[PDB]
């Protein structure tokens, strides 16, 4: 896709610093062929040996809109209640949505129930949703139905109450 | 096995509040019973023939009144004016003693809940004038999401004194 990629056959601990020099023996084709020290050009120098990042947390999530601008979120997994408001805290400082299900058990007024502890705290980003089965899917729809306006028409800002889902 | 009757609900004979105008035909009907109504609760107003005797009592001389009042096509509810009902001590008034009482001004909602959910402990002096002054404390209300949930924390709370919303 219009980049030209030079990879050393050997893996682990090796460098191509070069950036195609200049030979006095010829022509050169470094400077017309874009990969010259002054042009810019990335060099990601061969790592040492394997690496073994360790397990980060779902608030690793910090990753993701570091590099995609997303707006909506998800994840597979559900998110573990001790983890649910600093998530929460996430969502409302990064300017985004977090769809989320939670089962029948839930379904209380009570601080110890975390869906309860976003609403009483304001964590409006937070969005908690609910599945007897706890059908991760659900969320899939969900956000797959909200997020569908153009914010350009005359009418689009839609309600989600009675909503075709998937 | 959910129903309409929580998205669209639909109910049958209910009487619309009504309140004192400044219309001029807000008519009144003074009566000589003590059976509904005292000193203190010197009139009531009403719009519904229907609900004037579900309060007296269908064959009470006041809700035959009522009856011949609203049956006049041209009804002064028609022109925006609301019945009342006075009360004139006839006969040897009786006024049962009763408790000391305390009222809250503040009929607002919305604006207490959200208070009451972020403080987690309490603190409240009231005294019955009974003997010892109450001191109470351990009061929570993070899972009120309505009036009568913090009046009957309250009543729980209070001891010979019962607490209540309206």
Same mark, same amino acid.
């Given at each position: ?20 020099? =200049? ?7 470094? *400077? ?9 050009? =990335? ?6 040996? #394997?690496?073994?990042? *360790? ?12 590099? =995609? ?12 209640? *001790? ?14 949505? #977090? ?15 975390? =869906? ?8 409006? @980003? ?28 005359? @009418?689009? *800002? ?9 | ?14 009487? %619309? ?10 008519? %009144? ?28 009592? $269908? ?15 041209? &009804? ?20 049962? $003693? ?21 403080? &987690? ?5 009231? !005294?019955?004038? %009974? ?10 209300? !993070? ?7 913090? $009046? ?15």
């Amino acid at each position: 896709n219009g980049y030209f990629k030079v990879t050393s056959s050997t893996t682990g601990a090796t460098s191509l610093l070069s950036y195609l020099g =200049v030979a006095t023996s010829g022509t050169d084709i470094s *400077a017309v062929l874009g990969m010259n020290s002054e042009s810019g050009a =990335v060099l990601t120098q061969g790592t040492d040996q #394997v690496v073994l990042p *360790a397990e980060t947390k779902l608030e690793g999530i910090t990753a993701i809109k570091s590099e =995609v601008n997303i707006k909506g979120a998800m994840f597979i997994d559900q998110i573990l209640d *001790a983890d649910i408001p600093g998530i929460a805290s996430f969502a409302g400082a990064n300017n985004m949505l #977090v769809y989320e299900v939670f089962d029948t058990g839930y379904l209380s007024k009570n601080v110890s129930n975390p =869906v309860w502890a976003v609403k009483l705290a304001g964590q409006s @980003n937070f969005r908690c949703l609910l599945s007897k089965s706890g059908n991760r899917k659900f969320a899939a729809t969900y956000m797959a139905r909200m997020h569908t306006v153009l914010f350009s028409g005359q @009418n689009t *800002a839609i309600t989600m109450q009675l909503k075709e889902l998937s | 096995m959910a129903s309409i009757s929580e998205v669209i609900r639909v109910s049958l004979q209910q009487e %619309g509040r009504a309140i004192a105008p400044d219309n001029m035909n807000a008519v %009144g009907i003074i009566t000589g019973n003590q059976g509904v109504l005292s000193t203190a609760d010197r009139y009531r107003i009403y719009r519904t023939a229907a609900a004037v005797a579900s309060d007296f009592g $269908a064959s009470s001389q006041e809700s035959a009144f009522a009856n011949t009042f609203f049956d006049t096509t041209p &009804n002064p509810i028609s022109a925006g004016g609301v019945l009342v009902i006075g009360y004139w001590r006839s006969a040897s008034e009786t006024v049962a $003693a009763t408790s000391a009482t305390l009222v809250s001004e503040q009929t607002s909602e919305s604006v207490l809940i959200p208070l009451l959910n972020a403080i &987690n402990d309490g603190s409240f002096t009231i !005294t019955v004038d %009974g003997g010892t002054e109450q001191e109470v404390t351990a009061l929570d209300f !993070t899972g009120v999401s309505e009036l009568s949930e913090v $009046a009957t924390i309250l009543n729980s709370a209070i001891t010979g004194a019962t607490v209540s919303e309206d």
